[PDB]
């Protein structure tokens, strides 16, 4: 995941404030920050005066300081605030545009942008054009992955996929195949897929007539809530209107026909930020249609099905004869070796199975779950909540094809005496952060938690 | 005032509400920055005080010895507070009381020796560890003295 | 982690007048109402779209405000619907006021309010088995005079406490009125892991609210903000009325009695006692 | 604050020596060799290191799988 | 079968119980071997 | 079609204090295969549940646990008021496996010995979870039963899948003759509810007995943290309670003061008692066609009332089970919840 939040902080500060002028964008980005930062920001928003950092330290206690650093580093990186070495101290305060926009949003501000929606006869039916948006999303997914017939006419969308290198397909020969990007597209279920596509449209649509402030205004206004009336008609910039038409083509806009009307708020824009339920001629009833198969016997038992879904399953398992409720497929080392040929790591698939194919594995994941977390301290043996056997077999296939070991962290030095090194090693063993250590070299390559805690203890 | 003025004020408020109003912008925010500050002061004061609740002795051998002394004095006082309540075995109570006074003096000498040898900080820790039991036995002694004076005088 | 903050605002027009009587009449409950609306919106925004609920306690009963029982049969705009609906309901309730309303001043239905709110929490939690709701309710009371401590509600309050603890539902309380520490409420917040706030009258609470009435959803690594000690030296003697320390509690009656036994038939259950037992007590 | 970042590699010393050989063949991208069991490398070229490792192991073993 | 005076006089039983717990024998001796308590009442607590 | 208790006819007295001595059964019989793991494992699991429950609802009582292995009764938890000790003891047992024959007589005698210190106002009890179909006694049994009933010791037993004559005699004997206490089970859920109904205090129609005022005092929490110091376990504990009279620290409990030996409680225990003394009238199920009341809930706001004329559906019933004294409706969920968890009737509180 490119972690669009990282792209957000990527952009410079002045354009960040340019975006913060739009209160709805302020709210939407408030939705994204880690909870610690959320709470701290909500504290600061009202008392119109900077605050010393010492208070914001003493606010948090023990065994939870890691999140303090997470929040402060994130917020500084995206520069929502302005640290102030006023008297040599730290006089924190938000980018005041952010503060005022947010406060306006909380109590009836002047955000005509966020208020761009119009209330009228929302003749849009729940299934009404919702099925059409779902069908468009399925069509583009199939065309990108490659179906027997790809009716994907998104010439702009195809150009974005190709130039963006969305999938390892020979666009010169017209191929739309799964690359590392294609593997990720197979991985990111909904939010991941929509996010990758939005980032691709951003990167491709970045040359001329961008108006990035208007771009994000339109995007978040779409994700915020149903603008409905007068959206497409009134509430859009010129380039904003063009981007809206393009998104509506991309499915992310459920604009009605007649090419001129209010905004058509498809559920997809909601899906962009919701991180919630995923379900979308005139028939389609399934809260658990996807009937995948995955047990301890490493077999594929399917009753429920979805053609693109089962094709995704086939992307790492053989197909011989499609059946009524089943499809001939058995997951083996060869089955995942198919994706290993694409170099697909046995990592995304883990959480994928934990999440996807569950419409047919609800009872399976419940019996594996068994609520064996509160019962874990008492009964020390887990009831295969997340199947470890399958994980071990997958790791074995991955190991069979790999043979290389790597570690994260950074090399450390200036352990002048053996006493500091030994005490830090003991503390790390207490906290389980030392990958490896040696007093002879006074060096190691681990996470920064031990150094952080020692420095905090020393300075304060 | 009740009844009349009650309904009066009630209606006044009802109106004020109905009188558009409810300016959540005007909702205090904090109004007086000073008032705000004062509220924060109160709250940080309380946070500090309740935080003072951090939910390890030095001389392990003296610690165990003091623990033995505490157990001893505890059971001794146990027997008194049984007997001093219950009742005709007065002489048994007398023996218990004399022994308890002896134990109190013993612990006093113990504290003296601790202050002499372990110094002050360790002696301070010992005194802290033994404060509750010491207070209880002292109170028992005082209560017996009061009861004995009452019976005698 | 969604939370169901179910405020319980009591509004006694008697106590509303007392609030006007207290200090000056420099502003009716309107201040409290507006601050409550804002705080409610704040919580409604904070989490991932977690419901709320509000109940009242007028002089002759209680009635819901927000969930808006079947009647026909801006900013995110759901804030809009919640707030406008609440205010319409509350104005309707204020229409429900007259002399016959002035009549039944004998009681104060706060206990009914808390109990019903807890029932509501149970309803919502039970229906929403998926995505378990870390719920927790609130209490706003206009502290008035004319009764130093009404006690005829003592038991149902504690039953509320025990229900809360079993249901794992912290219950925070904000008393606005005279410097009379609402003992039962104080024990309620302290026991059920809550927070007590005895504000002065006319300050715009919104700061107090958003500070110390927003940290109870599903956090609890954070020091609560309770006032001075919460002594559990409990109820005064039923016969006497002076707070007891070394109690003297009868029997199956369970009433707590002072050092003054009437010698027979503890004055809450007709149970004559063993005069031998009476003498045994008198053996001191 | 001293934190020397890189691609830390830890394995058996024989595989470490083989990795050093390969790395020298591909112009010594290994930043440091912390000990007989740890290596500090630049993550830029570790991927092609693994690629060439796969190539040479396929060349040698060939997986008869008889 | 079991009586207060009976357990009081069950000296062999009492010494067996002394053998029962190190903590027990320790506290007992330091209440006794320290010129402290007659065992009678000491058990009168522990009946 | 209803399954309700008609009326409660001892809503005047219960044993509020208790000293219940649960006695399990760990003997070769309990190793048969009728309950899912066995008899024994399921038994001990439910025993843990019952321990938690009972020490909740009767938070002022004590309890002791007794097994019956190899014809011997080996006490596995002294009679004590701290649930955690008993919980741990049961944990330990559950990993150990039964043997020998159940010696009901020995267990009975051990109990009768065990409950002697319990004072007169406290009430005694035993709860035999008898699993087998035999005993093995080293003495006369009717001798023991007579001694028991002489010592005013009610006994309730929960046989497994049979009825044993002697046990029936035992229950009928100690409980003042009135036989209702030998309930035996026919299903696991029946077993859960068996323990549940064992939790509550036990009235039948109490003979006029001595009723006695009991001295006790309440503690006040402590403040300091570093001054950690304890007088009931002789440790350092960051802060606890003070006996109002003995005036010595005591680690958190409703326990008895270990210095001056008087009972300690806060009140909430007394509140639980109050809840048990005077319960509510069982909520009535309103007539299907004669109700004509509000179409909602009252405590909650449910939309489950009727359907208005639907051949058989409306002919079924009208979910309006409504309490008497307040005469307000309540949906089934609300009534179940009120009568199970919180006993303040919503409407009946408000008037
Ligand atoms: Zn203790
Ligand atoms: Zn005491
Ligand atoms: Zn209901
Ligand atoms: Zn009722």
Residue numbers in the entry:
A (entry chain 2): 7 to 286, 328 to 507
B (entry chain 1): 465 to 519, 537 to 567, 573 to 639
C (entry chain 4): 22 to 94, 113 to 323
D (entry chain 5): 2 to 67
E (entry chain 1): 168 to 214
F (entry chain 6): 107 to 457
What does the report in the manuscript say about this coordinate set?
The versatile nucleotide excision repair (NER) pathway initiates as the XPC–RAD23B–CETN2 complex first recognizes DNA lesions from the genomic DNA and recruits the general transcription factor complex, TFIIH, for subsequent lesion verification. Here, we present a cryo-EM structure of an NER initiation complex containing Rad4–Rad23-Rad33 (yeast homologue of XPC–RAD23B–CETN2) and 7-subunit coreTFIIH assembled on a carcinogen-DNA adduct lesion at 3.9–9.2 Å resolution. Altogether, our study illustrates how the Rad4–Rad23–Rad33 (XPC–RAD23B–CETN2) complex recruits TFIIH to damaged DNA in 3D structural models and provides the groundwork to visualize how the NER initiation is carried out in multiple, coordinated yet distinct steps.
To better resolve the disordered density, we refined a less populated class containing Rad4–Rad33/DNA at 9.2 Å resolution (Map 2, EMDB-22588), as well as a class containing Rad4 BHD3 (but not including BHD1-2 and TGD)-Rad33-DNA at 7.9 Å resolution (Map 3, EMDB-22576). The previous NMR model of the Tfb1 PH domain (residues 1–114) bound to an N-terminal segment of Rad4 preceding TGD (N-Rad4; residues 90–104)61 was placed into the density, guided by with 9 and 6 cross-links formed with BSD1 and BSD2 of Tfb1, respectively. On the other hand, the BHD2-3 (residues 489–632 of Rad4) bound to a segment of DNA at the lesion (at positions –1 to +1) were located near Ssl2. A ~30 bp stretch of DNA could be mapped along with the protein complex in two distinct segments with respect to the lesion: the dsDNA at the 5' side of the DNA lesion was bound to Ssl2, similarly as observed in the transcription initiation complex, while the duplex at the 3' side of the lesion was bound to the TGD-BHD1 domains of Rad4 near Tfb1 of TFIIH. In between, the DNA was locally (~3 bp) unwound at the lesion, as required for the simultaneous binding with Ssl2 and Rad4. In sum, our model shows that Rad4 binds TFIIH at two points of contact, straddling between the two ends of the horseshoe-shaped TFIIH: N-Rad4 (residues 90–104) contacts with the PH domain of Tfb1, and C-Rad4 (residues 648–664) with the C-terminal helix of C-Ssl2 through Rad33. The relatively small size of unwinding and the absence of Rad3(XPD)-DNA interaction indicate that the structure captures an early step of TFIIH engagement, and that DNA unwinding is needed even for the initial loading of TFIIH.
